[PDB]
């Protein structure tokens, strides 16, 4: 129960606040120091981290469903949840596996171009329609974010394009689910996370992750603590992510999640008065203008 006018601001604030700590703790865990010198045994089990995060999110979603928003049948077909989960997992795998093949568009275009495919896919598969103003706003936002994040044969770059396409397919599936089957945010989150948990669990049964991460954690129990908190930091952060997509759509969710980093950096610079580069002023101005035109005069 929230006012409609103060709905989008709530989602934006929630995601922005949650994912900042999410990233901080992800860095603290993945980087790690553990042993000393050669004993370091740097953390390399990313898939196990994603699996733990997925199971934690599923548990939190089940808690939310049982304690609140009860008496509501799902009405959604399971195969749709499975399709969304496979698309999400494939996109994440491809994105994580493209780091060591791309240098210039290394997350500059892999991310900051998240909306376009989704939007385009929505136009093609679901035959949706948006005003030309929306196209211009999305393009301006993407260009501004990409130009702001810039930091001082093309064979392997296909992986990033495949990741973007899979993300677009996931957005299309989510839009179809919410439009036709009236699936709730919590139900969608729980089912998608359960399917992803099953897939990842099947994946990590190979000795590389499970029977190695277990022993490694036994060596350094402290990590567990951080891990747990990280999981929580995802849950809340994921909740809003799976709420806005239901209330305003995958396109709005993608715009929020792709401009969150730029907003956070701008706010941190303003608070610290850091001397942002003169070029990046162009990117922030473009993003601001695109958002303004999206909100009004072409919404």
């Amino acid at each position: 129960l929230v006012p409609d006018r103060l709905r989008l601001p709530l989602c934006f604030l929630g995601v922005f606040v949650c994912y900042f700590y999410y990233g901080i703790l992800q860095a603290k865990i993945t980087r790690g120091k553990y042993g000393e010198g050669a004993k370091q045994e740097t953390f390399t089990f990313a898939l196990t981290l994603v699996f733990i995060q997925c199971v934690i999110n599923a548990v939190f979603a089940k808690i939310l469903i049982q304690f609140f928003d009860t008496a509501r049948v799902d009405h959604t077909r399971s195969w749709l949840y499975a399709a969304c989960s496979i698309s999400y997992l494939g996109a994440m795998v491809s994105s994580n596996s493209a780091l060591q093949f791309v240098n210039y568009p290394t997350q500059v275009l892999g991310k900051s171009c998240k909306p376009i495919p989704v939007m385009l896919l929505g136009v093609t598969l679901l035959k949706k329609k948006y005003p030309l103003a929306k196209y211009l706003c999305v393009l301006l936002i993407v260009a501004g974010v990409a130009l702001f994040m810039y930091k001082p044969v093309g064979y392997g770059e296909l992986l990033l394009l495949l990741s973007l396409t899979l993300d677009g397919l996931t957005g299309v599936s989510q839009d179809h689910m919410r439009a036709h089957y009236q699936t709730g945010s919590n139900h969608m989150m729980l089912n998608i996370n359960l399917w992803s948990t099953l897939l990842l669990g099947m994946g990590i049964l190979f000795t590389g992750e499970l029977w190695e991460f277990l022993s490694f954690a036994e060596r350094y129990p402290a990590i567990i603590y951080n891990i747990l908190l990280f999981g929580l930091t995802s849950a809340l952060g994921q909740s809003f992510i799976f709420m806005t997509v239901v209330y305003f759509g995958p396109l709005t969710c993608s715009i929020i999640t792709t401009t969150r980093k730029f907003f956070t950096i701008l706010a941190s610079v303003i608070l610290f008065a850091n001397p942002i580069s003169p070029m990046q002023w162009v990117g922030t101005v473009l993003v601001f203008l695109g958002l303004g035109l999206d909100a009004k005069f072409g919404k």
């Epitope: 049948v73 009405h75 077909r77 439009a179 036709h180 089957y181 009236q182 209330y247």
Partner: single-chain antibody
């Protein structure tokens, strides 16, 4: 609960004319840009026939004459080239909230006057007040353990429909909150049947009970219907 109102109680039209039936809801029935609205057609002495879902999507097999329009709390059903076939009562149903409600129904009249699923209901025709009643709907040509909702509906004298409850193939059941305390829906997969039990039936309960099969898509759509069983409560 949402109250559906059909403005024209009965329309007198000639052959070939265009007819528009208006249905209004007490609350917005849109859920993320989609209108959870359904239109059914019921010929005399026959179960209602599913026509439209989503307020604009014509059900497969329905003639192209029928068309739906509207949004928000106002909807309309249009049949431009009307013929003698489309002479019946037209009902508007909302699937926005759990207590699915049907409109009062609009009567349309002319001047001058193993390859499918089969449902069959059984039960006593006459029951004394305050007794317990149990109706059975038997399904043939299909299994009630497959992906389809199995609903119980009742039509009172005057053609005022009312959705009692339903049981999904998963075993999950939903009830009308008004009747949740009085009725109980169960199933028996071994015999491929499902039963509705009512406790302390009153004189008001007199009605014709149908058991229907529905699939959820832009709202619940009672696509297949049984033949209906009459129930009379008298002293």
């Amino acid at each position: 609960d949402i109250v559906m109102t059909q403005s024209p109680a009965s329309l007198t039209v000639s052959l070939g004319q265009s007819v528009t039936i208006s249905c209004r809801a007490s609350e917005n029935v849109e859920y993320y840009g989609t209108s959870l609205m359904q239109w059914y057609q019921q010929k005399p002495g026959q179960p209602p026939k599913f026509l439209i879902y989503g307020a604009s999507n014509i059900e497969s097999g329905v003639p192209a004459r029928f068309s739906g329009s509207g949004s928000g709390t106002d909807f309309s059903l249009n049949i431009h080239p009307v013929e003698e076939d489309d002479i019946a009562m037209y009902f508007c149903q909302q699937s926005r909230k759990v207590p699915y409600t049907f409109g009062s129904g609009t009567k349309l009249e002319i001047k001058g006057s193993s390859g499918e699923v089969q449902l069959q209901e059984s039960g006593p025709g006459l029951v004394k007040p305050s007794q317990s009643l149990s109706l059975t709907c038997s399904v043939t040509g299909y299994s009630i353990t497959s992906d389809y909702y199995w609903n119980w509906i009742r039509q009172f004298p005057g053609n005022k429909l009312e959705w009692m409850a339903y049981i999904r193939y998963d075993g999950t059941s939903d009830y009308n909150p008004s009747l949740k305390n009085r009725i109980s829906i169960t199933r028996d997969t071994s015999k491929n049947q499902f039963f509705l039990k009512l406790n302390s039936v009153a004189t008001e309960d007199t009605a014709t009970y149908y058991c229907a099969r529905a699939y959820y898509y832009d709202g619940i759509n009672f696509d297949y219907w049984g033949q209906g069983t009459t129930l009379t409560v008298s002293s």
